[PDB]
Design a protein around this ligand. Structure first.
Ligand SMILES: CCCCCCCC/C=C/CCCCCCCC(=O)O[C@@H](COC(=O)CCCCCCCCCCCCCCC)COP(=O)([O-])OCC[N+](C)(C)C
Ligand SMILES: CCCCCCCC/C=C/CCCCCCCC(=O)O[C@@H](COC(=O)CCCCCCCCCCCCCCC)COP(=O)([O-])OCC[N+](C)(C)C
Ligand SMILES: CCCCCCCC/C=C/CCCCCCCC(=O)O[C@@H](COC(=O)CCCCCCCCCCCCCCC)COP(=O)([O-])OCC[N+](C)(C)C
Ligand SMILES: CCCCCCCC/C=C/CCCCCCCC(=O)O[C@@H](COC(=O)CCCCCCCCCCCCCCC)COP(=O)([O-])OCC[N+](C)(C)C
Ligand SMILES: CCCCCCCC/C=C\CCCCCCCC(=O)O[C@@H](COC(=O)CCCCCCCCCCCCCCC)COP(=O)([O-])OCC[N+](C)(C)C
Ligand SMILES: CCCCCCCC/C=C\CCCCCCCC(=O)O[C@@H](COC(=O)CCCCCCCCCCCCCCC)COP(=O)([O-])OCC[N+](C)(C)C
Ligand SMILES: CCCCCCCC/C=C\CCCCCCCC(=O)O[C@@H](COC(=O)CCCCCCCCCCCCCCC)COP(=O)([O-])OCC[N+](C)(C)C
Ligand SMILES: CCCCCCCC/C=C\CCCCCCCC(=O)O[C@@H](COC(=O)CCCCCCCCCCCCCCC)COP(=O)([O-])OCC[N+](C)(C)C
Ligand SMILES: CCCCCCCC/C=C\CCCCCCCC(=O)O[C@@H](COC(=O)CCCCCCCCCCCCCCC)COP(=O)([O-])OCC[N+](C)(C)C
Ligand SMILES: CCCCCCCC/C=C\CCCCCCCC(=O)O[C@@H](COC(=O)CCCCCCCCCCCCCCC)COP(=O)([O-])OCC[N+](C)(C)C
Ligand SMILES: CCCCCCCC/C=C\CCCCCCCC(=O)O[C@@H](COC(=O)CCCCCCCCCCCCCCC)COP(=O)([O-])OCC[N+](C)(C)C
Ligand SMILES: C[C@@H]1CC[C@@]2(OC1)O[C@H]1C[C@H]3[C@@H]4CC=C5C[C@@H](OCCC(CO)CO)CC[C@]5(C)[C@H]4CC[C@]3(C)[C@H]1[C@@H]2C
Ligand SMILES: CC(C)CCC[C@@H](C)[C@H]1CC[C@H]2[C@@H]3CC=C4C[C@@H](O)CC[C@]4(C)[C@H]3CC[C@]12C
Ligand SMILES: [Ca+2]
Lengths: 1105, 92
């Protein structure tokens, strides 16, 4: 059948035909007009049946020969006499309205369908999500139009409680009264709740127009909105999204689906609202402007397992208004004052004439209702009585079940309605159980309900007592919220690749991931020995800083809004912002380095760059408050973050805006100085004091209190306890500024010598210069080996791959390797003694020297890149060479487009030679630089310097070269000028930041270096190997300075959040929009105080009476 | 305290609120004990108790002691002292 429906659902066909009233209408001949008229006790006439039991029977009479014995006339019950058959009407209707083709899903089932079957159709076939609420609207039909305000409120509130609680508004479907007002309400607040509210009208197949059109198995069946000018029949309504078209008989009989609606009001009740929540899906009843049989239906609800409550809408109509007044004028839960029956029954009488026979019979259906006032609710429209029905409806299911507030809260948690929990569940007098808000917190954290995690903390939930090991294990092992599916791909990549099917994640496995995403020497709290013991054994199972364990959780599970919540809570804000930037940055890299349908890396890198900006904006906040303590905030050991450092975490994530921030750049400036005050010293005197040692003792050093914000070495800090003479030398030579200038002078003296050796005759044996030069490069290479070993992450391959990423460190290896090839050939070669350069081993050795020296001039740009002005130009040069590449490839093609025709036209008689690869490229290249070769153009001229090249076709070449230079000089060189002019500012801005960023790695490399430059360094190397087989900088605070610093951190985070709102709130965009919203509210009130005074001036001539 | 919380962060490090409470009607009384500590404290009002919890936004506490629980009338005199000793200092 290719439809789950047809195998399962059916219709009803009235197989059996029975008489009507038995009166043939008029018109004496009775036998055939019996065929013309006789509405079966079905309700359709004999011929409208078309049934196969009744198709070849009208020939004789029909079913049931003769009178059939009046008793047996009273025997048609559809059960025996109407057949279940395959559906014939399920599809998608379409409404003809402005730009909305509004769709639905009609089914056409028999009323006998099992209630399980219905819910299945709704959920799997129609692919609907189980609701968090069901608002079953019951009212009267053809209720013309409600007053303008009362339609606005019941039109905003029903939509607001259905868009926020994902609810199914069960209805009647007929476009008259209830469904008519529900639909208009939808249309007045559509397109914000469009694909959120699912409105199922349960209509009969009786009172239904274009009934024959809806027929058609699996169709896009059409439908109209032109109300049939004559008909009492009813049309389905525009905005209802689904339809249950029950069938028992025919037209009329609008009472066979009432039982099926009740089934769906039950079967949803037995489903759990959420996988974690034990409460069933709620069901509420909304009465507005009802009927005579409403108050009957109301009675049924409040007498069931459990009592489906009722929210009545007074001020709209008759039954609501009746039911409004009666339960309002009731005893607390019971009878009335001195008999109120006179007014009540009179009140009941005017709505509906009953008249003491059954106007009393209402008083019984009207007593048990008001006796159940606790379950009944009423929205007093026009009295701000719970702020449209959304509060009232949702409230109705919390107050009227005498339920625990645990269940009342959790319902709000599944609804995501914090206001209803904070204004009706956390109200004064509420008394909670020992750990019930904890279970709410556990559900809010898993369900990613940040706004309840806020509330549960604000009330009393301590995350110190809350957060334990076995619980925080659960939080990783959930699928009941927003998840990072990569956390398993990461936990796989650390646990050797094997994940058993269960594999309940362990915190030790999370610690291994945090070590891998944070890189280097990071050691998490979970991988330590002290945790692997308490863990496998299982206050001690409670973590000391819980909100640092959940910040990581929220990040590893890719829960930014929870991460951007738990970050404000707790201490070490700037640290956690730089960790998170690092976790997301590594999570992002491993997402791009993997195969997956959703890349989830532009999401993670943005998440990383969101916390990276929080750290910078807190640094700018601390720096604007105190500069000295802000620099201390960059270098204190964290002690919950692997003894790391907020700066080290930023350098780990290449978070350049933080390292290029003026605070770090000023600390970096102060670590460069050392104990020397270069504000009352000059570079002349540092150089002078390197060459004149006793001039070290005439320059200004820095006190211990001008060196407290500066991370130091231990030995350096041990000489802040006392300045004596030998201490004053240890302060000079160990400053990074001095190690620099003490290396530059050796390096400049090195080039002066190596320039001399390369320009002067090189004899058999190396001269004293060339020995001094080899010694430098030899020991300089030992230093680079030592730099690589004593670097960072113990994996030999990592230290390698880092050091070979800098430009000049690649050049250093070529420069060092090439020099000792050249020395091997130079020194290892048999001198000829007739004349040098007859030995080609010797020549090759020298020519490597003459080329190796180019590496060593270009290395001066690394020394010159220490200046604030020069260095950004040096980095800039390379960023431009990379960006001008494709312009220069075009310039190389125009070159060959010219050199090959020229060489071919001017030298026709050439055999193949390697000189043909020079001559096609040589002169055309030197033309780019202004050499025109004027007397080689027009080789047939008299002034020509190539008179023998004159021959056939050579008159073409001056035309060719005229085009060539026009292209190269007038187009391509000036296009490249234009390139540089329009890319200058942005490469200069990048190069300033990359310069400021790499000033960390540079300055911090000159703390680790020995004191002696690369010729005499070997002493320092040897002394460091002696004390290796015989025996970086840190910020030392006393315990009171750590206190004063953690205060300063806290105080500056407060000023950050305070000043962020004070700016947002004090902005014209915010002041226009709240002004906008107040003038709305006022205007409403001004046309209501304006109404009241219009009800006062009428009361000047009435009181006059 | 609620008044402080409704107008905090503009007067945060400006208003100093000293509650002079007895060591009698005081919850988690045994927890506050501990010489020179960052001692913990809760805001989960003990479901059964007539006892009283210190309030969230008070920045200082004078926890007078004479006896035990109950007896909420031994600090009244000390508050009066601090209402006097400040009176004898010159405002500027
Ligand atoms: C970041 C840090 C990275 C570190 C990177 C470091 C990388 C270092 C890289 C090093 C690569 C070194 C390559 C050298 C090439 C030698 C070839 C040569 O000259 O052959 C000639 C000399 O042949 C001899 O045997 C000469 C022996 C005497 C001289 C000693 C050689 C010194 C080598 C230097 C040691 C360097 C110390 C390195 C210290 C570091 C052969 O020519 P011939 O004699 O004319 O003809 C022979 C044939 N016949 C027998 C038929 C006649
Ligand atoms: C240390 C030595 C420095 C010396 C300079 C050496 C050049 C320095 C190069 C810097 C950056 C530029 C990219 C790298 C270049 C290598 C190949 C390449 O990428 O090809 C590209 C295709 O290009 C072609 O297919 C045409 C190549 C023809 C070569 C002709 C050379 C002629 C002279 C000209 C040479 C004379 C020198 C010109 C200098 C201005 C593919 O590139 P892509 O996939 O689009 O990737 C671009 C970047 N991205 C990944 C971010 C998108
Ligand atoms: C990122 C940058 C990378 C580079 C990218 C670009 C590629 C660069 C590659 C270019 C091709 C070079 C091929 C050389 C051919 C062999 C030469 C030879 O054997 O001997 C010659 C070598 O001595 C010289 O004087 C010529 C060397 C060429 C210098 C280049 C100048 C033009 C710039 C080029 C730039 C523009 C390139 C435009 C695009 C193509 C000498 O003379 P001969 O006659 O050949 O032989 C001896 C005979 N004789 C004694 C009688 C004289
Ligand atoms: C603004 C000023 C211009 C005024 C306008 C009128 C134009 C005037 C042109 C007139 C054409 C006649 C000139 C040649 C004279 C006769 C033959 C002769 O002497 O040939 C000479 C070469 O020259 C040639 O062989 C032919 C040159 C033709 C190219 C002319 C340019 C076309 C217009 C513009 C093109 C631009 C693109 C067009 C699209 C915009 C032979 O002399 P040789 O070379 O020294 O070699 C002799 C020695 N050999 C025997 C050993 C080889
Ligand atoms: C730039 C300032 C900053 C600091 C720089 C770092 C400072 C350190 C820098 C470099 C290392 C030390 C340099 C001097 C070493 C050689 C001394 C010498 O004369 O050797 C040479 C001596 O022997 P000879 O000359 O072969 O003797 C021949 C004698 N005979 C002919 C009589 C047989
Ligand atoms: C590794 C770390 C190095 C650090 C430096 C420490 C080591 C440096 C120390 C000593 C090394 C020098 C040893 C000299 C031995 C004698 C040489 C000789 O015979 O005569 C030469 C003398 O010497 C010179 O003229 C100097 C040669 C080097 C030039 C650069 C010196 C400055 C660099 C380093 C110092 C500056 C500091 C830089 C800071 C800004 C040349 O003689 P002449 O008179 O020209 O010959 C006549 C020519 N005629 C034949 C055509 C007529
Ligand atoms: C494959 C070759 C061996 C491997 C070399 C691989 C490079 C290794 C690295 C370095 C090499 C070690 C230093 C130079 C060695 C000189 C040797 C020499 O012959 O000197 C001659 C003069 O020249 C000198 O005496 C030069 C002395 C200055 C050296 C500069 C460093 C001093 C700084 C201190 C700080 C630390 C310095 C050290 C840091 C490493 C004297 O020798 P000779 O015999 O009297 O005369 C020459 C020969 N003849 C007899 C034919 C005329
Ligand atoms: C790990 C890094 C790579 C290392 C590579 C390995 C390096 C070492 C390579 C090679 C070993 C040295 C060979 C020894 C010479 C044998 C021949 C001989 O005896 O002398 C002949 C030399 O004839 C020539 O052509 C010499 C050319 C030498 C230069 C080539 C190497 C360039 C290295 C590239 C740069 C790399 C820099 C580093 C880049 C990072 C002639 O001289 P003769 O014999 O005295 O007398 C005449 C006899 N005859 C006329 C009859 C012929
Ligand atoms: C025995 C020997 C006797 C003495 C020897 C004397 C040797 C003299 C040695 C050097 C000359 C330069 C002296 C000026 C220094 C100024 C101060 C300074 O530090 O400025 C900057 C230079 O920082 C550097 O690192 C400069 C490195 C220079 C070496 C490159 C040479 C270029 C050669 C290529 C040219 C070829 C032509 C070369 C000639 C053929 C750094 O300062 P900053 O980062 O801005 O910090 C201050 C910031 N503030 C202002 C905010 C506070
Ligand atoms: C004999 C002596 C001559 C003079 C000596 C001169 C010494 C040199 C002078 C100055 C050196 C400048 C310092 C560089 C600073 C670091 C830059 C760096 O790391 O790499 C930069 C790129 O790579 C380069 O820029 C490569 C180095 C460029 C040198 C230019 C050679 C061109 C010649 C060949 C043509 C000759 C034609 C003829 C052929 C025969 C950084 O680029 P980026 O943008 O950050 O990232 C790249 C990735 N991207 C592509 C996606 C963007
Ligand atoms: C620009 C728009 C179009 C206008 C073009 C105007 C056309 C130009 C007009 C006329 C055509 C060119 C010929 C005129 C000159 C002939 C004189 C002569 O003999 O010259 C030489 C030969 O030269 C030849 O034999 C060349 C023959 C044709 C070359 C191909 C067409 C060039 C036009 C390209 C157009 C590119 C268009 C590109 C399109 C963007 C010299 O010969 P010789 O040495 O005296 O002979 C004796 C030799 N012997 C002793 C060895 C035996
Ligand atoms: C896409 C681009 C198109 C242009 C181009 O790049 C690619 O195409 C390349 C092909 C090259 C030639 C290949 C073969 C040889 C033979 C050789 O014969 C040695 C003989 C003898 C010495 O005397 C041995 O002993 C001499 C050199 C020559 C002619 C090359 C010249 C350069 C050319 C034209 C290159 C040119 C730049
Ligand atoms: C084709 C070969 C055999 C001939 C020689 C090629 C020329 C172009 C080579 C010889 C040595 C080379 C230089 C060696 C060292 C450096 C330092 C480096 O930081 C940038 C490149 C630079 C500046 C090289 C540029 C190109 C260079 C000048
Ligand atoms: Ca020129």
């Amino acid at each position: 059948q290719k439809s789950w429906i047809e195998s399962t659902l059916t219709k009803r066909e009235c197989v059996y035909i029975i008489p009507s009233s038995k009166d043939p209408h008029r018109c004496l001949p009775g036998c055939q007009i019996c065929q013309q008229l006789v509405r079966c006790f079905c309700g359709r006439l004999v011929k409208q049946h078309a049934c196969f039991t009744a198709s070849l029977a009208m020939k004789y009479s029909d079913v049931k020969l003769g009178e059939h014995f009046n008793q047996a006339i009273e025997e048609w019950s559809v059960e025996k006499h109407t057949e279940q058959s395959p559906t014939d009407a399920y599809g998608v209707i379409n409404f003809q309205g402005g730009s909305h083709s509004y769709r639905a899903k009609y089914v056409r089932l028999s009323y006998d369908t099992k209630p399980e079957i219905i819910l299945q159709l709704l959920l799997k076939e129609w692919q609907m999500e189980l609701p968090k609420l069901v608002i079953s609207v019951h009212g009267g039909m053809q209720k013309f139009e409600l007053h303008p305000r009362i339609k606005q409120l019941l039109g905003k509130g029903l939509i607001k409680a259905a868009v926020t609680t994902g609810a199914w508004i069960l209805t009647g479907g007929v476009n008259t009264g209830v469904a008519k007002h529900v639909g208009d309400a939808l249309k007045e607040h559509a397109s914000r709740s469009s694909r959120k509210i699912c409105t199922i009208g349960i209509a009969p197949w009786g009172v239904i127009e274009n009934r024959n059109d809806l027929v058609g198995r699996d169709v896009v069946a059409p439908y109209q909105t032109l109300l049939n000018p004559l008909s009492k029949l009813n049309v389905l309504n525009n905005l209802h999204s689904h339809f249950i078209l029950v069938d028992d008989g025919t037209v009329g009989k609008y009472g066979a689906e009432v039982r099926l609606r009740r089934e769906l009001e039950k079967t949803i009740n037995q489903q759990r609202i959420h996988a974690r929540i034990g409460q069933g899906v709620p069901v509420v009843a909304l009465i507005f402007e009802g009927g005579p049989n409403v108050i009957l239906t109301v009675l049924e609800y409040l007498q069931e397992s459990p009592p489906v409550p009722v929210v009545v809408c007074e001020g709209t109509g008759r039954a609501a208004d009746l039911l409004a007044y009666i339960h309002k004028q009731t005893e607390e839960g019971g009878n009335l004052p001195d008999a109120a029956e006179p007014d009540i029954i009179s009140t009941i009488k005017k709505t509906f004439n009953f008249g003491q026979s059954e106007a009393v019979h209402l008083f019984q259906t009207m007593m048990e209702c008001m006796k159940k006032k606790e379950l009944i609710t009423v929205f007093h429209i026009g009295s701000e009585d719970h702020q449209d029905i959304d509060v009232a409806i949702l409230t109705a299911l919390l107050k009227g079940t005498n339920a625990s507030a645990f269940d009342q809260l959790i319902l709000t948690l599944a609804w995501d309605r914090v206001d209803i929990a904070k204004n009706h569940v956390f109200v004064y007098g509420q008394q909670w159980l020992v750990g019930s808000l904890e279970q709410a917190m556990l559900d809010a954290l898993v369900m990613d309900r940040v706004s309840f995690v806020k509330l549960l903390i604000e009330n009393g939930v301590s995350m110190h007592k809350f957060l334990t090991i076995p619980r925080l294990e659960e939080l990783y092992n959930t699928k009941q919220g927003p998840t990072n599916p990569m956390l398993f791909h990461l936990i796989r990549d650390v646990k050797q690749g094997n994940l058993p099917p269960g594999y309940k994640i362990t915190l030790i496995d999370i610690g291994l991931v945090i070590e891998y995403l944070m890189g280097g020497t990071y050691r998490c709290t979970y991988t330590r020995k002290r945790f692997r013991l308490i863990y496998n054994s299982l206050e001690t199972k409670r973590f000391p800083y819980p909100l640092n364990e959940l910040l990581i959780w929220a990040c590893l599970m890719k829960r930014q809004v929870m991460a951007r919540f738990l970050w404000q809570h707790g201490e070490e804000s700037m640290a956690k912002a730089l960790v998170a930037c690092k976790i997301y940055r590594s999570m992002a890299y491993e997402a791009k380095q993997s195969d997956l349908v959703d890349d989830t890396s532009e999401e993670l890198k943005q998440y990383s760059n969101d916390f990276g900006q929080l750290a910078v904006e807190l640094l700018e906040q601390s720096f604007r408050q105190d500069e000295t303590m802000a620099m201390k905030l960059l270098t204190y050991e964290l002690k919950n973050w692997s003894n790391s450092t907020c700066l080290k975490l930023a350098v780990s994530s290449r978070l350049r805006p933080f390292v290029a921030h003026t605070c770090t750049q000023m600390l970096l400036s102060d670590m460069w100085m050392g104990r020397l005050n270069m504000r009352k010293n000059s570079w002349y005197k540092v150089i002078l004091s390197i060459l004149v040692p006793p001039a070290i003792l005439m320059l200004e050093y820095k006190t211990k209190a001008e060196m407290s914000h500066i991370p130091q070495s231990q030995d350096a800090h041990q000489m802040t306890m006392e300045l004596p003479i030998t201490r004053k030398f240890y302060a000079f030579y160990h400053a990074p500024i001095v190690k620099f200038w003490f290396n530059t002078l050796a390096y400049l003296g090195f080039l002066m010598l190596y320039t001399f050796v390369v320009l002067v005759k090189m004899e058999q044996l190396p001269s004293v210069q060339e020995w001094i030069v080899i010694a430098y490069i030899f020991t300089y290479a030992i230093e680079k080996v030592r730099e690589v070993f004593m670097s960072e992450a113990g994996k030999i391959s990592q230290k390698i791959k880092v050091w070979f990423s800098d430009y000049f460190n690649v050049s250093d290896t070529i420069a060092i390797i090439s020099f000792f090839v050249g020395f091997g050939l130079r020194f290892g070669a048999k001198w000829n003694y007739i004349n040098a350069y007859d030995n080609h081993v010797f020549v090759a050795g020298r020519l490597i020297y003459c080329l190796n020296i180019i590496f060593w001039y270009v290395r001066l740009l690394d020394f010159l890149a220490v200046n604030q002005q020069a260095g950004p130009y040096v980095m800039m040069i390379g960023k431009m060479v990379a960006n001008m590449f494709y312009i220069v490839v075009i310039m190389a093609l125009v070159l060959l487009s010219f050199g090959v025709p020229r060489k071919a036209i001017l030298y026709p008689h050439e055999e193949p030679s390697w000189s043909l690869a020079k001559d096609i490229v040589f002169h055309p290249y030197w033309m780019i630089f202004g050499e025109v070769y004027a007397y080689e153009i027009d080789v047939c001229a008299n002034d020509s310097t190539l008179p023998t090249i004159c021959g056939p076709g050579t008159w073409l070449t001056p035309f060719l070269q005229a085009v060539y230079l026009f292209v190269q000089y007038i187009i391509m060189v000036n296009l490249l000028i234009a390139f540089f002019n329009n890319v200058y500012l942005q490469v200069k801005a990048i190069s300033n930041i990359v310069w400021k960023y790499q000033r960390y790695h540079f300055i911090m490399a000159y703390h680790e270096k020995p004191v002696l430059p690369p010729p005499l360094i070997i002493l320092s190397h040897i002394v460091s190997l002696f004390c290796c087989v015989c025996k970086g900088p840190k910020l030392f605070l006393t315990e009171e300075d750590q206190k004063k610093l953690h205060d300063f951190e806290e105080q500056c985070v407060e000023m950050y959040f305070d000043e962020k709102d004070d700016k947002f709130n004090s902005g014209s965009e915010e002041r226009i929009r709240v002004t906008f919203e107040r003038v709305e509210q006022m205007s409403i009130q001004i046309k209501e105080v304006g109404d009241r005074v219009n009800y006062i001036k009428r009361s000047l001539q009435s009181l006059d009476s």
